[model samples]
Target: SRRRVVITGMGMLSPLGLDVPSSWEGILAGRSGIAPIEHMDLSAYSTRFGGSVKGFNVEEYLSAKEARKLDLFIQYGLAASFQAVRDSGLEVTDANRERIGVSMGSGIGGLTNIENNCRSLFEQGPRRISPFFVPGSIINMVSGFLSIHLGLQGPNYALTTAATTGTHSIGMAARNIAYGEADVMVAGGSEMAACGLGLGGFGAARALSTRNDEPTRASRPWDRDRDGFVLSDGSGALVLEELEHARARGARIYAELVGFGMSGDAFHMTAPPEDGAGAARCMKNALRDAGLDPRQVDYINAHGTSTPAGDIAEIAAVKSVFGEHAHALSMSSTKSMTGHLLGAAGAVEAIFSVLALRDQVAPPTINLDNPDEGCDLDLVAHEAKPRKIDVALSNSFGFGGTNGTLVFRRFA
Candidate 1:
C-alpha cells in the first residue's frame, strides 16, 4: 500500500512579515512587501526596488557566534525550520531522531557572501576571505546545519532548481516519507537574492521591474502594466509526516499532501511556450498522481510572478488543463504581495495554499488593476475571497524550463 503524507507544521519568513501568520495577514489585507532597495546601492541598476526581509534577528534562531558564521540564506532557512519543528511539537528523542530528515535549498545560495569574498579576493587579497566561506555559502549547508541542530539523522539533502527549488524539495521530502525512507521531513527553500550581484544580473537580463516610483505596485501579476518580476528575500518550510506517524503523536494536521508533479518546457531556457504546454503537463501530472480530476481542484496558488509573459503563459496553461473548470476555480498570486521570492517562492506558496485550505479562503492577487486581455479568469482581485476550498494546487516554474506542482487537500 502506498503511504500517505500530510503537512503537520509550517513556517515562513517573507518580505511581508517575519512569520507565517504575519505574512498571511499582510496577504489578506492586500499589502505589498515590495519596496525601495535600501540594503544595497542600486543607483547603477535599472530596477531600484525589491522585497527585502526586515525585522528578522538571526539570533532568535541561532547563537550570535553561529549566526555570524553562516550566510543569510542558510540563516533564514534554519530559522524557518526551527519554527516548523517547534510548531509541530516534534521532540527529537533518541528513537525518533533517526526518523526525521531535512531538505532545504536556495536558488543562488550565498550570492551576497560569494560576491563579498570575490571582491576581497580581487581587490584586497585571498587572505581577507573567511575560512568558513564555502560551508557558509553552499546551498546544502541549510540541510546540513538543520540536521545537526535538530539531531535528525534521516535523509538530508537539498535540491537546487532555481525558482522550483522549494516545491521540488517539499515534494521530494514528502516522497521520502511516503516511500518509508523517513517518517518526518522538514523541507523548504530559502533565498537572499536582493544583493548587488543578484539585482544586477537579473536586471541586466531585463527580468526585473523598473517601477521604482511605485515600488508597492511593481509586482502586479496578470496586470497589463506588469513589466517583470520583483526579486525578494524569503524562506519557507513545512513538516511532512506520514499519516500514521502524525496521528500517533496527535499532531495538528494542516493539510494532506496528495500529489506532486514536475515537468520541463523543453522549449526555452528562460521562457515558457506561449501556450504554457509544459506547465499544463505539470498540473495534469499532479492531478493524475493524486487520482483527482481537474474539476476537483478549487484553488490554485499560481506561479504568476507579475512578468509580462509568465503570467499570461500560466493562465493559458490553467485554461488548457482545467478547460471549463478554469473559470469555476479561483486562482491568485500571493507574489502580488510578497514579490517574487525565487527559490523560496514555491515553499512559501505551498504554505499559503495549505492555509487557504485551513481557512477556506483564497488569498488575493493585489495590484491587478487592469487585467491583460487574456487574463480574464477569476483572478481573486485585490481582496481575499472566502470559498469552500477542498483542494488547493500550487505551481512553481523555473528558468531552466523546470516546473513543479503540488496538490494539497483539506484534511478530513
Candidate 2:
C-alpha cells in the first residue's frame, strides 16, 4: 500500500520577511520585497535591483560561532530548519534520531562563500583563507549540518536541479517516507546568490530585469513590458510526516502532499519548449499522481519568471494540461513580490500554496499590467482574493528545461 504524507509545519526566510507569518502578512498586504540592491555594490551592473531580505540578523536566529562556520545559504537553511523543526512539534530524541531524515537542495550552493574565499586566496594569499571554507561552501553540507544540529540520521540527501531543486527535494523526501525508508523528513531548498558573481553571470546572459528605476515593478510576469527575472536569495522548509505517524503524535497538519511530477525538455538548455509540451506533461503527471482530475484544481502558483518566453510558455502548458478546466483555475506568481529565489523559489512557492490551501486565500501576482496577449488566464492580479481551494497546484521550471509540479490538498 502507498503511504500517505502530510505537511505538519513550514518556515520561510525570504525578501519579504524573515518568518512565515511576517512573509504571509506582507503577501496579504500586497507588499513588494524587491528593491534596489543594498546588500552589495552593484554600481558596475546595468541592473541594480533585486529581491533582498533586509534587517536579517543571523545572530538572532543562530549562535554567533555557529553562524560564522556556515555560508549565507546554509545559514538561511539552518535558521529556516530550526523554525520548521520547532513548528512541527516533532521531538527528535535519541531513540527516534535514526527515523528522521533531511532532504534539502541548493542549485548554486555557497557561491558567495566560494567567490569570497577565491578572491581572498588570489588577492590576500591562501594563508588568509579560513579552514572552514570548504565545509562552508559545499552543497551537501546543508543536509549534513542540519542532520548534526537536529540529530537526524536517516536518508540525508540533497538535489541540485537548478530551479527544480526545491520541488525535487520535497518529492524525494515524500517518496522516502512513502516507501517506508523513513518516517519523517525535513525537506526544502535554500539559495544565496545575490553577490557580484551571481548577478554579473545572470546579467551577462541577459536574463535579469534592467528596470533599475522601478525596482518594485521590475518583475512583471506575463506583462508585455516584462524584461527578466530579479535575482533573490532565501530559504523555505516544510516538515513531511507519515499520516499515521503525525496522527499518533497529535501533530497539527498543514496540508496533504498528495502528488508530485517532473519532466525534462530536450528543446533548450536555458529556455523552455516553445509549445510548453514538457511543462504540460509535468502538470498532467502531477494530477494523475494525485488521483484527481484537472477540474478539481483551484489554484496554481505559477513559475512565472517575468521573462518574455517563460511566462507565456508556462501559461500555455497550464492551458494544455487543464484543457477546459484551465478557465476555472486561478493562477498567480508570487515571484512578483518575493523575486526569483532560483533553487529555493519552488519551495517558497510551495509554502505559499499550502498557506493558500489552509487560509482559503490566493495571494496576488503583483506587477502584472497589460498582460501578454497569449497569456490570458485568471491571474489574481495586484490583490489577494478569497477562494475555496480544495486542491492547488504549484509549478516550477528550471534552466535546463527541467520542470516540476506538485499538487497539495486541504487536509480533510
Candidate 3:
C-alpha cells in the first residue's frame, strides 16, 4: 500500500500575523491586514494598497550576516521552516537526514531584488550590483536553502505556477513520500513580490484594486463592490510525514492529505473560463481521487480572489460540483481578510482549512456585506461559525489557466 500522508506541523508569516496561531486568530476574528502601500513610493502607481506583512525582523530568526545575504521572501520561508521543524520536533541527524526532503515554491521569485538590480545596472555599474543577487532571488532558492539549513538531503523541488504554486508544491511533496521517495517532506510556498514590478506589473494589467480610500474593505471577495485582487506577501510551511513514520515519532497529526488534483483551463492566459468548467473539473478530480461523493464535504475554502470574473466563476464551479449540497456547504474566502498572498495564498488558506477541521469553526468571509447574484450560498459571512466538519477542500487557481485542489480530512 502507498504510504499515508498527514500534516504534522505548520508555520506562517503573513500580513494577518507573523505565525500560525496569531494568523489564525486574526482570521477567525475577521480582521483585515491590508492597507495602503507605505513601504515604497506609490505616487506613480494606479493601485496604492496591498496586504504587506507587518513588523517582521529577519535578524530575529536568522543571524545578521545570514539575513543580509538573502532577500525578504527567502527569509520569510526560512523563518516558517524553522517554526515548522520545531513544532514537529523533527530532529535531523546522521541516521535520518537522507530520508527527509523539501518542496517549496513562489510565483514571482524576487521582484524586489530584480527591480533593485536593474536600477543598479543602469545607473551605477556592474560593480555596484551585489554578488548574492542570483542566489537570493531565484524561485528554487527557497527549497534549496531550506534543505541546506535543515540538512534535508532527500528530494528537493520547487514550483512557480502563478497563484497555485503552494498547493502544487504540497501535492507534489505528498506524492514523493507516498511513492517511497522520502519519509517526511517540508512543503509549502512563499512570495514577496510587493515591490515595484510586483505592484506596477499587476497594476498595468488592471488586475489589482485601487481601493486607496478603504484598504480594510478592499479585498471583498464575493461582494458586489469588489473591484480587483489586493496583492499580499507571506510564507506558509507544513511538515508532511508518512503515517507510520509520524506515529513512530508520536507526531501530532493535524489532518490527512487525502486528495490532490490539478488541471488546466486551456482557455485563457490570465482569465478563467467564464463558465468555470475548468475549476469544476479540477474539484471533481480531487473528490474522485479521494474516493468521495460530493456530499461528504462539509466545508470549502474557496479561491475567491475578489476579481470581477474569477469570483463568480468559482461560485459557478462550486454549485456545479455540489448540486443539492451547495446550499448546505459552509464556504468562505479567507482572502476577504488576508487579501491575496498570490503564491502563498494556497498554503496559508490550506492552513486555515486545517485549522477549521481542528476547531470545527469556519473562518468568516469578511467585507461580504453584499453577495453577487449567484454567490448567495452559505458564505459564513462577517463572523466565524461553529460547525461539524469532517472533510474540507481548499481550492487554488492561478494565471495561465492552471488549477489545483487539495482535499483535507479530519483524522479518522
Candidate 4:
C-alpha cells in the first residue's frame, strides 16, 4: 500500500519578500525583485542586477552568537525552516522525533564562505582562517543544523544537483515518508551566492544578464530581448507530512505532492537540446507517475530563466508533450520577477505553484513586452491570470543536463 503526501505548511525568504504571503502578494502584483547588488560591490562586473531579499535580518530567528557560526546559506535556510516549522505547529515529542526528518540543499552551498576564506588564506595565510570555517561551509550542514535545532532524527539527506537541488530534495523527502522510512519531512533548498565570485563566475560564462541600467527588466523570460539569466539568492521551505499524519493532527493541508520525475539531457553539460527531448520526456514521466494525461495539466510554472536557449527549449518541450492541448493552458515563469534562485528556484517555484492552485490564479511572466516568434502559447504576459487550476507542473532543469519535474494537485 502506497502512502499519500501533502504539504501542511510552507515558508520562504526570497527577493520579493521575506515570507510566503508577502512573496505571493508580490507575484500577483507583477512586482519585480531583481535589483542592483546591495550586499557587495558590483562596480567591476557587467552583470550587476539580481534578486535579493531586502531587509532580511538573522536576529529574528537566530541569536547573534548562534547566527555567527554558520554560512550565510545555512542561516538563510534556517530562517525559512524556522518559519515552516512554526507555521506547521509541529511539536517534536520524543515519540515523533524519530519519525521526522529533513532534506534540504543548496546548488552552490557556502560559496560566500568559501570565497571569503579562500581570499583570506591566499592573502593573509592559515592563521587568518576562522575556526568556524569547516563546520560553516560544508554542504550537508543545513540539514544537520535544522535537525539539531528541531530534534528530528529520521533520515537526514541532501541533494546537490545544481538547479534541481530543491525539487529533488522535495521529491526525495516525500519518498522517505511514502516508503515508511519517515512520516514527516522539512525539505527545500537555500542559497546565498550574492558574493563577488558568484556573480563573476556566472558572468564570466556569459550566463548573467547585462541589463545593468534596467535591473528589473533584466530577467524577462520568453522575451525576445532577454540577454541571459540573472543570479539571485534566497531559501524556500515546505513542511510535508503523510496524509494520515496531517489528518491525525488536524493540520491544514496545502496541496498534494502527487508526482515527481527526473531525467538527464545526455546531450550537453550546460545547454539542453534544441528539441527539448529530455525535458519533454521528463514531464511525460511525471504525468505518467501521477496517472494523469498531459491534457489534464492546467498550468506550468516554467523553468524559464530568461536564457535565450533555455526559455525556448522548455516551451518547445511543453508544446511537444502537451500536443494540441498546449494552447489551452497558461504557462509563465516567475523568474522574471524573482530572478533565478538557482538551486533554491525549484523549491520556491514549488511553493508558488501550490499558491497558484490554492488561489486558482496563474502567476504572470512579467516584463514580457514582446514575445519572440515561436514563443507564443498564452504566455500570461505582464499580468496574473485568473483561472481554475487543478493540476500544475513545476519544471526545473539544472547544469550537467539534469532535469526534474514535479506535479502538484489540489488536495481533494
User: What are the runs in model 4 whose C-alpha is more than 4 Å off?
Assistant: none
lDDT of 3 by residue, 1-412 (tens): 2789999989999998999999999999999999887888998998888888899988778889978878888888888877888889888999999999998899988888888988999999899888999998888888898888888899998888989998998889998998999999998899998898889899999999898999999889989999999999999999999999999988899999999889999998989887899999999999998878999999999999999999999999999999989999799999999988888889899999999999999999999999998888999999999999999999999999999999999997
- Clash-forming residue pairs, model 2: none
Candidate 4 clashes between residue pairs 3 or more apart in a chain or in different chains: none
Q: How well is each residue in 1-412 modelled by candidate 4, as lDDT tens digits?
A: 1789999989899999999999999999999998888777888898877998899899998888988989989998898888888889888999999999999899999988888889999999989998999889987888999999888999998899999999999988988888999999999999988888899999899998999999999999999999999888899989999999999999999899999898999998899999889999999988998888999999999999999999999989999999999999999999999999988999999999999999999999999999987998988999999998999999999999899999999998
Q: lDDT score of model 4?
A: 0.92
lDDT of 2 by residue, 324-401 (tens): 888888999999899999889988999999999989999999988889887778899899999899998998999899
Collision count for each candidate, in order: 0, 0, 0, 0
Tell me the lDDT of candidate 2. Answer: 0.91
Query: What are the RMSDs of all candidates, in order?
Result: 0.8, 1.0, 0.9, 0.9
TM-score of 1: 0.99
Error of 1 at 97 (Å): 1.2
Each prediction's Cα lDDT score? 0.93, 0.91, 0.91, 0.92
Q: After superposing candidate 3, which stretches have Cα over 4 Å from the reference? A: none
Q: What is the lDDT of residue 144 in candidate 4?
A: 95
